[PDB]
Amino acid sequence: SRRRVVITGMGMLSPLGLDVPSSWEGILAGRSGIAPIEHMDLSAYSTRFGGSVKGFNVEEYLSAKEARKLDLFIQYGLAASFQAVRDSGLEVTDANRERIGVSMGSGIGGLTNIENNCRSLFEQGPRRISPFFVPGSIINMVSGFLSIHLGLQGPNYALTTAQTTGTHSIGMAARNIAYGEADVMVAGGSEMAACGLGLGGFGAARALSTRNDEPTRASRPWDRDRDGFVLSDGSGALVLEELEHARARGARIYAELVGFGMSGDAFHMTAPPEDGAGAARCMKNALRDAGLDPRQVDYINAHGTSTPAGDIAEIAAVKSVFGEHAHALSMSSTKSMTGHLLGAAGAVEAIFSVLALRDQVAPPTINLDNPDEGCDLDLVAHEAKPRKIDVALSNSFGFGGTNGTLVFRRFA
Amino acid sequence: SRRRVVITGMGMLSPLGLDVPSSWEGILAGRSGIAPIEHMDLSAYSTRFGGSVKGFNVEEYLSAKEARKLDLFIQYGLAASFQAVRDSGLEVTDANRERIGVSMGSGIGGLTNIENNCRSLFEQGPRRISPFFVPGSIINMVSGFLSIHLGLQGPNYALTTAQTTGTHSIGMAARNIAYGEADVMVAGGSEMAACGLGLGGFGAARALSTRNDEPTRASRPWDRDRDGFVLSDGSGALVLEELEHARARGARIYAELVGFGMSGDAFHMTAPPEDGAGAARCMKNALRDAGLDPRQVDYINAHGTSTPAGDIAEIAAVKSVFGEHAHALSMSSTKSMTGHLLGAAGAVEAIFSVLALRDQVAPPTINLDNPDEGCDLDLVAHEAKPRKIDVALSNSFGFGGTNGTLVFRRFA
Ligand SMILES: O=C(CN1CCCC1)Nc1ccc(F)cc1
């Protein structure tokens, strides 16, 4: 048997806001967080825009001196994590610290730090490399620094599954609790890949929208004029908690995490199969994990990256899994507004999926002006749709054909 | 209810050999894999040696067409994975491909690739960044590429827990099988951090031995004259398999994986606590997980990095866990010979722990000329020690205070 897992705390940095409620307010108003990237010369680049975190003050969380030791992706992960733990009301004690762990991931990790240290290395040789280069750049330092700051002695790890990281982090954290290896986990992801290497790297793959004249219209999942994803920064963190532990201290419970699916496409390094066979297996795995019939799903927060092949693969996958119910559920891509936070995408979209359940509203797919061939599902074009949502799925599909699906249900 | 997990296949690139048997021959003869680094100019660096993989031919495993797209850590991870899968005799089919997954991790991933593309960006601009920069550099692409080439549709993910990565990867892969999420997992890790940023970055932290004039004597775990770890390259992969699945196909079983522990130190970003409190908590979690009396432990493959603080912390942890039995078990650090493979350290050491069980021999801690204050256990100084080994433990500890322990025992 298995213990039940609930969500008692959430935290976020996104292109829409410096916390969950500001981010969610933008989501429900169909606001874009996409803009030309500032304080960085992108003249030589084919993409000049993305989703930046605007006005982040790390000194709300850390001393300037401790913040100087950490890449921006670690700062963003710690910000989301501290928010989530504060939002949970959890009190860490000598009696429970061994039962409280962390799994905060990243898809690409410390590119900005690597970039700045390469500069030192190439210009001035190796002796000018920061002593904090390694610990301040490696992906497991959000889990590390959080555990040290809060005295958490539970399972301490980090996932890195590219664009699936945040979904895998939350799912495997839920497993740790379900199987009695922890009572509480802080889980999610963070990303800051808006440097030359990130914009240049995805740019060299021709993976990015180049709609420089209209950045807010660039991310247009399932629209016939989409031309690739929009690179975005930020972080999401959830406090996952065993139900009886949450009830005992009188925690406010947002929702229950009832299912987690994983699958590998085993198809291509960067492209999904056109029929979405991998995403279909993964969703079926998640629904079997939750003991739910496909008919019980009301809302899907799609991966919905605004790539030609990715968006059409997800329609095919949903039709395959849900058959005569595929049109009854609502499915939207919040990436139409946030852009693609890569390893944090699954973390912020899990939060949006939980809030869709709290507020009984499907977030919109903005910019869906002309649905493409076969994109005839309820994709919540343009504006939020209030509706009954008992069960919400959040899907992530990443490089290496790695898939994750989370199943949340209303808790009462 | 929880299923049993056995080791049916193993694969390796190390500084001592291009497979498991050649590496193991080196381990049992007390041979050093450490040498001045030849693949770049280190005259400006404070450390100019490490454990390189010698004579690796990627065309033994991959088309030169596919190989050119991939960082060395991915090439090394794939080589070790391919070796492990062949060694297992497992046939991948439509009937079992959804039940076979992969969890190959890395501490740092494609730092060489990122450095080389950073050089291109800075000297020549963004249009010279490789189209393969992202899929060729990010940590989950061992798992990704392995799944694509072999058609593995099971759980597909990657851990990154710095120097604990290989141990966590194997333990969590075993949990996957234990809990029924897969029947087979390929799990381990790979690392190639021997670039300017890697040697420069660890150099800036003063974490590396600077014994440039005697590289084979540099790695001296528990010796009073130790002055930091030696940076080494390679990969370990194990095929983990549910017991009844292995029995049903006539698999050769090397050993049983009975125990896995994790803990966080919650102490310091980089330094372990002097008293080994976190390591002790981890080992106790693993021994309880395996249903063992601590007196059943015969051999410990120590983390044993040859750092002042790390080595003495491990003695303190072992004395705390084992009390008087600490003087009866054998404990050795194969890092004395291989150096520190970082994310791959736990993967190769798990393999050395399994072969310790197969061959009933404790590998030596070479260079242990003058054991330091309190290092008065059987550390198997200088020469391999044939002895009864029913239960073997492999420990890893990393940046962020992240600890892992695996417990293996003989299978009949
Ligand atoms: O293991 C080797 C070759 N060995 C390594 C050192 C001496 C000879 N090759 C290999 C194994 C599996 C596979 F799928 C493809 C190639």
Side-chain angles (χ1 to χ4, degrees):
Chain A
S1 185
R2 217 145 63 145
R3 309 191 301 166
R4 290 175 66 186
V5 181
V6 293
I7 308 314
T8 58
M10 309 194 287
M12 174 182 300
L13 302 173
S14 79
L16 295 176
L18 300 175
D19 66 12
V20 167
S22 63
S23 291
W24 184 232
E25 186 183 65
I27 289 285
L28 293 187
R31 195 162 54 78
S32 178
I34 311 305
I37 282 161
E38 289 160 359
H39 320 113
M40 192 190 182
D41 182 342
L42 296 181
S43 297
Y45 294 72
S46 52
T47 301
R48 292 176 181 154
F49 64 86
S52 309
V53 176
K54 295 155 275 264
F56 173 61
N57 191 171
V58 70
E59 296 180 27
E60 293 186 13
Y61 303 93
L62 304 175
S63 74
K65 182 172 183 71
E66 289 288 327
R68 279 194 294 272
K69 299 185 186 166
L70 310 175
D71 191 276
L72 282 180
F73 89 93
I74 297 163
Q75 290 182 27
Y76 294 170
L78 287 177
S81 297
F82 284 129
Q83 284 179 30
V85 172
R86 182 192 300 148
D87 182 53
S88 77
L90 178 61
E91 307 180 324
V92 183
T93 64
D94 294 328
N96 65 19
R97 74 175 69 263
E98 298 187 37
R99 302 292 299 171
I100 305 167
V102 191
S103 176
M104 285 287 289
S106 179
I108 309 174
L111 279 196
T112 293
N113 264 12
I114 291 171
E115 194 156 291
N116 299 354
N117 278 276
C118 281
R119 199 180 323 290
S120 306
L121 174 61
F122 300 156
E123 280 162 32
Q124 307 169 354
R127 297 316 170 93
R128 306 311 294 337
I129 291 168
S130 167
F132 297 104
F133 173 58
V134 181
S137 299
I138 59 177
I139 287 168
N140 73 304
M141 197 48 50
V142 177
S143 298
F145 195 98
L146 187 69
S147 77
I148 294 152
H149 205 270
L150 291 183
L152 312 186
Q153 293 185 339
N156 197 297
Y157 69 101
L159 299 207
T160 189
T161 56
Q163 301 92 345
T164 308
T165 299
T167 295
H168 283 163
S169 300
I170 292 161
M172 283 180 65
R175 297 269 194 260
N176 294 138
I177 299 171
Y179 290 115
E181 296 164 13
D183 297 329
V184 184
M185 301 284 290
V186 182
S190 65
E191 205 83 60
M192 205 296 179
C195 56
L197 288 163
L199 289 155
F202 284 106
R206 277 112 127 89
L208 298 182
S209 179
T210 59
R211 188 177 304 271
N212 291 313
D213 57 338
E214 283 189 289
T216 64
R217 293 210 195 274
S219 195
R220 55 201 305 105
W222 303 293
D223 180 269
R224 64 147 181 248
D225 301 317
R226 72 198 184 273
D227 70 322
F229 74 90
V230 177
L231 182 59
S232 290
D233 312 337
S235 58
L238 295 74
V239 175
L240 286 57
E241 187 165 356
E242 190 276 327
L243 176 51
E244 286 325 304
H245 190 276
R247 284 163 162 174
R249 73 189 183 82
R252 168 267 288 100
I253 292 167
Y254 288 101
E256 186 176 356
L257 178 43
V258 283
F260 172 48
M262 301 176 78
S263 86
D265 288 348
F267 182 78
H268 188 266
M269 71 179 83
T270 53
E274 175 186 301
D275 65 358
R281 279 188 312 272
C282 186
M283 287 191 272
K284 278 166 176 137
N285 288 343
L287 293 170
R288 195 182 314 118
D289 187 42
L292 299 175
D293 184 293
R295 272 208 333 186
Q296 305 178 257
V297 172
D298 294 324
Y299 176 59
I300 299 178
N301 186 283
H303 197 46
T305 63
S306 199
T307 68
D311 294 1
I312 200 66
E314 292 185 68
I315 302 303
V318 164
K319 283 178 180 201
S320 158
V321 167
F322 291 100
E324 287 170 7
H325 181 77
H327 291 268
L329 62 85
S330 295
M331 174 164 77
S332 64
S333 173
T334 50
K335 292 196 185 55
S336 63
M337 286 167 287
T338 66
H340 190 347
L341 275 79
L342 304 183
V348 305
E349 291 154 11
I351 295 164
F352 297 153
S353 296
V354 166
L355 297 168
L357 289 167
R358 187 193 71 196
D359 295 346
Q360 298 290 287
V361 56
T365 309
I366 71 163
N367 295 320
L368 184 41
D369 299 327
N370 299 290
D372 215 348
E373 201 52 36
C375 293
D376 56 5
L377 296 179
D378 167 19
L379 294 175
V380 198
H382 304 302
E383 295 172 334
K385 175 181 153 138
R387 57 157 298 156
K388 180 150 195 310
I389 306 173
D390 186 42
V391 173
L393 263 64
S394 182
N395 289 329
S396 300
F397 316 128
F399 290 5
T402 179
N403 301 307
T405 299
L406 287 170
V407 191
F408 300 98
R409 184 168 208 165
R410 269 182 314 188
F411 178 82
Chain B
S1 187
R2 197 155 101 162
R3 298 182 316 165
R4 290 170 66 191
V5 180
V6 294
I7 308 311
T8 55
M10 306 189 291
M12 180 176 295
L13 300 183
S14 79
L16 296 169
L18 302 171
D19 63 17
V20 172
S22 62
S23 289
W24 186 234
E25 204 185 58
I27 291 295
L28 288 195
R31 206 166 46 76
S32 179
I34 309 312
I37 282 168
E38 277 162 358
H39 54 81
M40 48 174 320
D41 185 346
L42 294 182
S43 35
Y45 292 68
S46 49
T47 296
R48 299 197 278 275
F49 59 92
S52 298
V53 179
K54 290 151 289 263
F56 176 59
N57 179 204
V58 71
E59 292 173 319
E60 176 51 11
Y61 301 92
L62 294 171
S63 57
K65 206 228 149 168
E66 297 272 23
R68 45 174 240 112
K69 307 171 182 178
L70 309 176
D71 195 85
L72 287 175
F73 90 98
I74 297 167
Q75 301 181 12
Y76 293 169
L78 288 175
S81 295
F82 283 139
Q83 279 182 22
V85 161
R86 181 171 290 180
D87 183 46
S88 74
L90 178 70
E91 307 200 283
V92 181
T93 73
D94 288 0
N96 68 14
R97 71 175 71 263
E98 291 176 11
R99 302 295 299 159
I100 315 164
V102 46
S103 181
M104 286 290 289
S106 182
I108 278 131
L111 200 56
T112 303
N113 206 27
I114 299 163
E115 192 184 310
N116 289 344
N117 278 275
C118 209
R119 195 174 272 283
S120 292
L121 173 62
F122 286 171
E123 294 174 0
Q124 300 159 346
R127 292 149 173 107
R128 297 305 297 282
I129 293 159
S130 171
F132 301 111
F133 171 66
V134 181
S137 310
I138 62 177
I139 287 168
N140 74 305
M141 293 304 310
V142 179
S143 296
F145 281 111
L146 186 67
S147 74
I148 290 166
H149 280 293
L150 289 182
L152 313 182
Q153 289 182 346
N156 188 314
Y157 65 101
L159 301 199
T160 184
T161 57
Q163 302 100 328
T164 314
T165 298
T167 294
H168 283 162
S169 298
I170 293 167
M172 285 201 36
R175 291 284 204 260
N176 293 143
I177 296 168
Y179 298 153
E181 295 146 19
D183 301 328
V184 181
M185 289 295 287
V186 183
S190 66
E191 203 82 62
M192 202 292 168
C195 61
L197 285 170
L199 286 138
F202 284 116
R206 309 163 74 72
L208 296 173
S209 172
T210 59
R211 202 183 290 279
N212 296 296
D213 297 315
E214 238 178 355
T216 71
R217 294 188 53 208
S219 194
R220 52 202 309 107
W222 303 294
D223 181 82
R224 67 162 187 238
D225 293 310
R226 64 190 186 283
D227 73 319
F229 80 92
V230 176
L231 175 67
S232 287
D233 312 343
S235 52
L238 292 76
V239 173
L240 282 62
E241 185 171 355
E242 191 270 329
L243 175 56
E244 291 321 317
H245 186 284
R247 271 172 170 166
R249 76 165 180 94
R252 171 274 319 280
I253 297 167
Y254 282 107
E256 185 173 0
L257 179 39
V258 288
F260 175 47
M262 316 171 50
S263 75
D265 287 339
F267 177 65
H268 189 268
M269 269 180 6
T270 60
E274 311 193 346
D275 64 2
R281 278 195 305 272
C282 188
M283 286 189 274
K284 293 182 185 177
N285 287 336
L287 288 170
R288 285 189 302 258
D289 194 52
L292 297 173
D293 184 336
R295 294 179 301 172
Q296 289 172 266
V297 171
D298 294 319
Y299 173 65
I300 302 175
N301 189 285
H303 198 44
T305 61
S306 204
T307 64
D311 290 5
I312 190 71
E314 280 194 84
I315 302 290
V318 169
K319 287 184 169 177
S320 162
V321 172
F322 292 102
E324 291 300 335
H325 183 74
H327 299 286
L329 57 77
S330 296
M331 179 162 64
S332 69
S333 167
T334 49
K335 293 195 177 58
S336 66
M337 291 169 282
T338 64
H340 197 341
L341 274 83
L342 301 178
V348 302
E349 287 150 20
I351 293 169
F352 298 152
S353 299
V354 167
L355 299 172
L357 290 165
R358 188 192 66 190
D359 294 351
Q360 297 291 288
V361 60
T365 307
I366 73 168
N367 292 320
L368 184 46
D369 304 321
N370 299 288
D372 211 342
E373 199 91 292
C375 302
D376 62 352
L377 302 181
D378 180 9
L379 298 176
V380 200
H382 305 302
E383 287 177 313
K385 188 207 195 119
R387 63 158 292 158
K388 177 249 171 202
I389 310 177
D390 188 54
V391 172
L393 194 143
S394 182
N395 291 324
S396 311
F397 319 123
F399 296 175
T402 196
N403 304 291
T405 300
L406 289 165
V407 188
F408 297 100
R409 70 178 308 171
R410 291 180 300 190
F411 181 72

